């Protein structure tokens, strides 16, 4: 009745969350947030990126001029989305090194075509075929010019076209492979043509082959698509005596944030900086498990489906007349106004208060590292291809091995970051408890003794005002020193 | 005659300490440490669990084609296929454009399962053989290749199609003959120059043979260039040649699997090891390894370091008639039954005990971090090539830059990890010692004083039964308080 | 009776400075410390040091124009180098030519680091040699590439050439050869007779065959003609065969292939007289720091490229800048302390004093340098790498060469950022720990003769002259000497 008891404790919660640290695989903390994004709406947000839905068309069909893809002429995009249902309805074709041409056009992000009048005098022009119906007429690829005998002759063609602008020119052209020797001489007179497109830097010579194409959409013939880039100050030189599929001009090559993605996800009305083939995902978290193929500012792909960062101290439930005990035994599920506080027992009764300074001190540290964790947007656009449909060998072996190495290294960084941050999270919250106890230990000077359970036995009368003067940093030990030393030192 | 006792707090020491690295120190001595970089091999490739296929005198490509001394490899399968350096070609001279890619894709397929398809081939004679490819006592040829050639002194143009109506990728292996002389060209194919064209809906491959180019190999100044074509389901194979065709007899079934290939001369043995290197099989108990960067299976990660030692014990401090001394001075080499404990000196003499609770808290934290360091498995199969015999240029520069960049990043992660863990290992063990010392301090309340050297001066008769009460937390400070406050406070 | 007998005060503190430096930790984005150091090298003199690496200045010559033998590049014959520096002012003044896969030929010649050419005498009987053109003037005569031979009519005939050359010695042979693409059919028949030629260069491992095209080359320096350049490597025990009827540009021998530290770099930085292990296109940079933001293109032992332009490593304690009563480390630091990081301030009957503790000052300094030595020890010596800046639009191979380097920098930028944050959080902790250890060291040898005032100071309950204070500082303090006097003052008897 001539003493009081002051106890030091920290809060606790009835649920709790398990996290990983350097030490333990499962340790229970009060709060925790998720770092790995693993869900998506399924809708690609048409904002803030220019999304161009390919619909029934691939990038190459819209490039060449397949008539059902004529809506895509001169179109521009940030992310061009190819669908699975896309399909070819013009003349049969192949593209040697298909992936590269699809890659560089996607990076340019524009189908802006500029027409150029080549001379083509001595040949007839704009040949078509019934397999490429535009409307009801027999047409052909809109950006390709198909040359063929004039007055039953077909001379050697020497045609040039300089680049005097300050900007790169992509010329798309082709070589015909007739079904029979009849079709060869009917269109080109000579038994075998030769195609040679040249610059000051490059030269592409293609010998056409006769009847070397399988049956596609009514025809055993086809055209091989090639491309040539003409830098400023350079010149295009076409040289053919047969089977030339001429360019009607060039596509302008730009450099920008543009790329291409394969996805069947619907385009919706929303805003999201990050885009996956699964759909748009938020970029609030630092890591994501949705898909390694991403466009825009996105979390980093990791193998882990979950990585929980601890945002609170160890949870130690009380699991146990009225008596009070300190942090040594357990935490306090009854303290909701703070993380650290004082439970007292004195002459006027018993009470709880929380300590604002130490609680904010811990929170400021906890939420400072959250800001350090989330400050990395890391914005990426046109990357490498990460899923493949044909067997290719050496090059995709390296293209896979690079991406797979990238993911293992970031999965390592993520696992270690969460483990270090949490081991530091638990330690800093332990430190703020101990500092508050030692701060209270030293105010009391010689007026109290440490009971061992995180509580002080104060050897003098200590009304609610005196407890307050301990909580508040205003306890004067000299006022009570005599009364305390009397009760302490009895024989 | 004496009214006091001395209770000292200490930790253990060992005579054969081990040096490790920390964030601070380059060399600090601890009691125990374990190695993390695997650096030794038995020199044998364990045949379990993975299916090892010893290539013996055969390369994968010779076994693919059907070099008669490799006929045993027909239709064989593998998980890892081992090419010996003694392997050698004994059939018709040949070369393969993009040899690496064909070797890579066949290796990752993991099977030589062949399916005979009967092409029509009317108008030519099949199964041509040579003396430079003796199968048994007979002039023969590659077992999977059909060397077509004149019939009735006529060689008509060949139009053949074989559709892939399966649901699974087909691998056709074909070739092109390069005769030694003009006389040999016309005797075998009538025409002065041939033309081999293999076509899918997606690709075309047209080859025009050169005459006399090949150097003398095993009796012949001739040879065949091998090319490959993959026909996807629903697509169709179309062969077309007016000369020099080396035809396929069918397709190799393509599979997706854990299979790969490795260049090694290590002997195959009877044992079991998850990890395989060209040096031989290595244990994957350690997270890192310095044996070889070429690995197959669940393997440790390759690092540049040849030794990384993880501290698994506290700082080693030798203790070095003499008053008993605590941990502030030095450890205790005599302590064997624990890492922490008490030495006391009272009226019954001296004694030494160990504290289980503080020792397991240190041991369980050390085992907890080991289990997190060992938990990584890392199972990789078909990767990229990492050693090269020919000078190539752009592509292997990237293949070398990728692997060399990988090895540096993991060597950093391994070095930093050891330094972080050991600093934490030392810090956590020093913490347990401080926690046991403070736990004892507060049991003694006002009955003792901290002598400074990590020892308490207890101011009352404290027989062995009283020490044991302090040791297992049953000391009642009130029982000895009046006596102790008497002895402490004399003037 | 209040404080009747005299007492003394002994305070524990740490130094502070008026010009602190902000650094990053695991907790805080900006926390002020006393001393810091920069880890990211972000400046260069702009000069490529001619030491300790053998630098070769291309001047008006590219590596391939020196390779082929462009007459204004005759000084570069048989020259060697560690780093060869192509200049952007260079140019080709011989016969017009293109090189399919020019990047690979440039790369392997640079990696060999030598243009050591070994003349071999092929058997060109039946053809005439040393074909020259006026677009390639050497001296005042019409000439041609010094290391190429241009074969052409022999008595108005030019038959099928069968030519062989064995590789009888050790180590590889690089053969450089080409194919002429004549401007007109007249030039085709006036030089080669046959309508169309055919160049075939073969080994046991490979074929290379080329069917030349007429009039396929644009007008360059007076000629609508050109030569396509091709190369073949002949391993030991293998053999070179040249089979051609027309349009053959024959080699005069091979370049000896070596393997070593050699490479090539594109830079307009002037060469200077100085020594530096690291070379960038921007110039040479010091390799003391572990990271650099100058250029991702480097040669030699260089700091690693990172996106960050500054990463400051804390190399001192937390800076906390600082009634006649002294106070301790709990409140603030002591700007007055110059001779040490930690120390004591006291007030007693002889006055007020101050002294620095050398033991705990070194304990922090030695731990800080234990960090620096682990941080600064990373040499990282890389030589011939991959190309990292491109001028032509290529596609698939280009995307991977960019994605690999782009992924590398992001991974080291992470490692750099995390390392600075960990190293600084550990610095602040250890410097705080040494303060608390020095205070507890004093607390324990004072025994029952003082009380902790709570501000990092002790109220010592006995007369304590300067020699008394010095004993506490030297640790020679004996508490029993003062124990009776102190207990009498602490507790009233
Ligand atoms: C577009 O190309 C045509 C055709 O020439 C091509 O050009 C080169 C680059 C290669 O691609 C070749 O393979 C092609 O042949 C050019 O037509 C020629 O233009 C010139 C100059 O204008 C004409 O020369 C004139 O000829 C007059 C007499 O020609 C008449 O008589 C001759 C016989 O004497 C007869 O062969 C010809 O067919 C005519 O009937 C002459 O009085 C005048 O002074 C001048 O020399 C030449 O005749 C044209 N050829 C043809 C077949 O029409 C174009 O010039 C070119 N245009 C552009 C803008 O470049
Ligand atoms: C080389 O052989 C192939 C294989 O037969 C030839 O292709 C075939 O060409 C015929 C031409 O009529 C095709 O017939 C058509 O088939 C469609 C299928 O639905 C049918 O609807 C039509 O009424 C018509 O009968 C046949 O399908 C086609 N088959 C294949 C596999 O391509 C090819 O023509 C031959 N080469 C030459 C130069 O003739
Ligand atoms: C020094 O530290 C190492 C820590 O790696 C100690 O080695 C470890 O010792 C324990 C028990 O002695 C071994 O546990 C065993 O685990 C296997 C399963 O892996 C189980 O089958 C056994 O029954 C046993 O429980 C552990 O494997 C072993 N680890 C290593 C890497 O050696 C070592 O004992 C310490 N030295 C001293 C002197 O304490
Ligand atoms: C493999 O394909 C060959 C083609 O080289 C098949 O033989 C040819 O089959 C066609 C169609 O049945 C025959 O064409 C017809 O010939 C008669 C002969 O008078 C003619 O009157 C018809 O108007 C038509 O043109 C062709 O003669 C025939 N050639 C030969 C040499 O047999 C052959 O059937 C296929 N192999 C098989 C089915 O085993
Ligand atoms: C182009 O010239 C080359 C080189 O002279 C010719 O190849 C050579 O052909 C002869 C043919 O008898 C080879 O001789 C053989 O040597 C082996 C090994 O000593 C021996 O066992 C045989 O009995 C025979 O004597 C010679 O080795 C071979 N040399 C090379 C480098 O290939 C080639 O035939 C010529 N081609 C034309 C179209 O002129
Ligand atoms: C913790 O320390 C206390 C104090 O040393 C231990 O309590 C008492 O320890 C003594 C000696 O070990 C026990 O004496 C024994 O009692 C049995 C039963 O009467 C008797 O047959 C033996 O000859 C001996 O005298 C005593 O029983 C025990 N106290 C009680 C209530 O059992 C205690 O055992 C220590 N606990 C641990 C886990 O070490
Ligand atoms: C603030 O921190 C920096 C970096 O820790 C300190 O710079 C270091 O200063 C020492 C000299 O006290 C340098 O060591 C000396 O190096 C020279 C050769 O340069 C040698 O002749 C001496 O015998 C001595 O070893 C050290 O290199 C230097 N480090 C750096 C990165 O500059 C600086 O002194 C600190 N300032 C204060 C006021 O503490
Ligand atoms: C194929 O057509 C191209 C272009 O139509 C021809 O290139 C042209 O070749 C003539 C050669 O006399 C060049 O004339 C020269 O021009 C320079 C610069 O103006 C001048 O200084 C000379 O005195 C001479 O007149 C002309 O510039 C050049 N044009 C282009 C665009 O390159 C080429 O010759 C034709 N093919 C054949 C086999 O003739
Ligand atoms: C070393 O040399 C390289 C060039 O070889 C320098 O890169 C160039 O840096 C300048 C900026 O000083 C870039 O110009 C402008 O940069 C701003 C960003 O500050 C950007 O927003 C503008 O659009 C513009 O690009 C320039 O583009 C860049 N590249 C080239 C080829 O000039 C590099 O800065 C030099 N090293 C250091 C440390 O500065
Ligand atoms: C506390 O420790 C310090 C450091 O050891 C003591 O200061 C040093 O004290 C020694 C004597 O113990 C001085 O040595 C003397 O130097 C004079 C120079 O005039 C010489 O004539 C003497 O023969 C003797 O060698 C030393 O100079 C002095 N340090 C400095 C920088 O002067 C201090 O005395 C110790 N105090 C206590 C109370 O233990
Ligand atoms: C595993 O094999 C590799 C390569 O066969 C060994 O590395 C070679 O070591 C020799 C030492 O005499 C060097 O001369 C070679 O240059 C090394 N090759 C490479 C590619 O580095 C390696 O030492 C072997 N490992 C073990 C444990 O025996
Ligand atoms: C634990 O339960 C409380 C009950 O109010 C709840 O507010 C809290 O969100 C739960 N924990 C987490 C991590 O959500
Ligand atoms: C995203 O799509 C890929 C491929 O279609 C699929 O494997 C993966 O499970 C999907 N993930 C989510 C979260 O929908
Ligand atoms: C972030 O700081 C705010 C400021 O009070 C706080 O509400 C929140 O709980 C903090 N986040 C944590 C502690 O995870
Ligand atoms: C608490 O402290 C504040 C200043 O920090 C003071 O104004 C107030 O009076 C104090 N409360 C009591 C009860 O002393
Ligand atoms: C390999 O070839 C050599 C020489 O012909 C022979 O002695 C050896 O037995 C062969 N080994 C196998 C496994 O075929
Ligand atoms: C090689 O030289 C000899 C002698 O000069 C000559 O007889 C022979 O024809 C030459 N071989 C050729 C030109 O292939
Ligand atoms: C590291 O040691 C040097 C030389 O002894 C010293 O000058 C420097 O101050 C030390 N480091 C720091 C951060 O003080």
Author numbering:
A (entry chain A): 8 to 327, 332 to 502
B (entry chain B): 7 to 326, 332 to 502
C (entry chain C): 4 to 325, 332 to 502
Quote from the publication:
We describe a focused, protective antibody response, abundant in memory and serum repertoires, to a conserved region at the influenza virus hemagglutinin (HA) head interface. Known broadly protective antibodies engage sites on the major virion surface protein, influenza virus hemagglutinin (HA). These include the receptor-binding site (RBS) on the “head” of an HA subunit (1–5), sites on the HA “stem”, and a recently identified site at the interface between two heads of an HA trimer. Stem and head interface antibodies realize their full protective potential through Fc-dependent pathways that lead to the killing of infected cells rather than by blocking viral entry.
Among circulating strains of most HA serotypes, Arg229 is maintained by strong purifying selection. Some laboratory-passaged viruses have a substitution for this residue. Most head interface antibodies contact Arg229 and fail to bind 229 mutants. We determined the HA trimer structure of laboratory-propagated A/Bangkok/01/1979(H3N2) with its acquired Arg229Gly substitution. The mutation led to a distortion of the 220 loop, the major contact site for all head interface antibodies. Despite the substitution and rearrangement, S1V2-51 bound the A/Bangkok/01/1979(H3N2) isolate. Constraints on the 220 loop, which forms one side of the receptor-binding pocket, are likely to limit potential pathways of antibody escape.
